[PDB]
A paper describes a structure:
A major factor that limits the expansion of shrimp cultures is, however, infectious diseases from viruses, such as P. vannamei nodavirus (PvNV) and M. rosenbergii nodavirus (MrNV), which have inflicted heavy economic losses. The Nodaviridae genome comprises two single-stranded positive-sense RNA that encode the capsid protein for viral capsid assembly, the RNA polymerase for RNA replication, and the B2 protein for host RNA interference suppressor. While the shell domains (S-domains) of PvNV and MrNV contain conserved sequences of 62% identity, the protrusion domains (P-domains) and N-arms show low sequence identities of only 17% and 43%, respectively. In this work, we have determined the cryo-EM structures of T = 3 and T = 1 PvNV-LPs at atomic resolution, the crystal structures of the P-domains of PvNV and MrNV (PvNVPd and MrNVPd), and the crystal structure of the S-domain of PvNV (ΔN-ARM-PvNVSd) in the T = 1 subviral particle (SVP).
As for the MrNvPd, three crystal forms (P3221, C2221, and P4332) were determined. The MrNVPd has a structural fold consisting of eight long stretches of antiparallel β-strands similar to the PvNVPd, but shares a low sequence homology with PvNVPd. In addition, the MrNVPd dimer is stabilized with hydrogen bonds between Leu255 and Tyr257 of the β1 strand and Lys287 and Ile289 of the β3 strand. Second, two MrNVPd dimers (C2221) in an asymmetric unit form an X-shaped model with the antiparallel β-strand interaction through an extensive network of hydrogen bonds between residues from two β-strands β2 (Gln273–Asp278) and two turns β1/β2 (Val266–Pro267). The two dimers in the X-shaped model are orientated with a tilt angle of 130° and with separation of ~63 Å between the two linker terminals. Notably, the sequence of the interaction region (Gln273–Asp278) of MrNVPd is distinct from that of PvNVPd, and two types (P21 and P212121) of PVNVPd structures do not exhibit the X-shaped conformation.
Residue numbers in the entry:
A (entry chain B): 2 to 126
B (entry chain A): 3 to 126
Write the structure that this text describes.
């Protein structure tokens, strides 16, 4: 494995996905993001391309991986929030686990909240 | 002393506000300043902002040679906080962005908001 030289640093920011929506109005649950390069270091940020529910769908996310730092916030009604970030390292099999805490006023058919994963392509990252 | 590859971290704490429009349809530019000269960055949108409920659309590109991508904001019903731009800062630590806005109302608009991410590795 030949490391990418520092002078050749670039960011890959095209890995996007969906957070699994809640089945209850108040829920705490986990989701495993899979298929990441094992042991690579990432920043995950929220983004939004999503019709507002207009029923106050609040979601907060943290990461369960060792040494992960930060928190992500979504809110879709009036005071829109698409905020925060988590720095984390994928585990030895290319997975990271997150904890979702949701508090939705209505949850008939919730549209997923959306994330983007950012990876510096440098060294063996 | 350069940062060796095994000590890669990210700094994602530089945030800022995009200059807001004064006409309903407007094109303008903004110089972002105070970046490490010649370092490579990624800029992403974020939102922590009360919606205008009057269809404030903003589209952003970067004028820097080497820049790639585009950012979109929209605050009413079909919400957009989307896209990204990868770019290098210039020799004096700056980058120029072009904003194209299409706002159904523009009475004292609240800025759209951004986050700059830097990989801390090598001399970046």
């Amino acid at each position: 494995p030949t490391p990418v030289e520092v002078s050749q640093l670039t960011y890959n920011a095209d890995t996007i996905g969906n957070w699994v929506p809640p089945t209850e109005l108040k829920q705490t649950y986990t989701q495993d993001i899979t298929g990441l390069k094992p042991n690579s270091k990432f920043i995950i940020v929220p983004y939004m391309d999503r019709v507002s529910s207009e029923v106050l769908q609040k979601c907060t996310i943290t990461c369960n991986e060792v040494d992960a730092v930060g928190s992500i916030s979504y809110f879709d009604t009036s005071a829109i929030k698409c905020d925060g970030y988590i720095s984390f390292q994928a585990n030895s099999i290319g997975e990271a686990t997150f904890t979702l805490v949701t508090d939705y006023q209505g949850a008939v058919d919730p549209k997923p909240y959306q994330y983007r994963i950012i990876r510096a392509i440098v060294g063996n990252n």
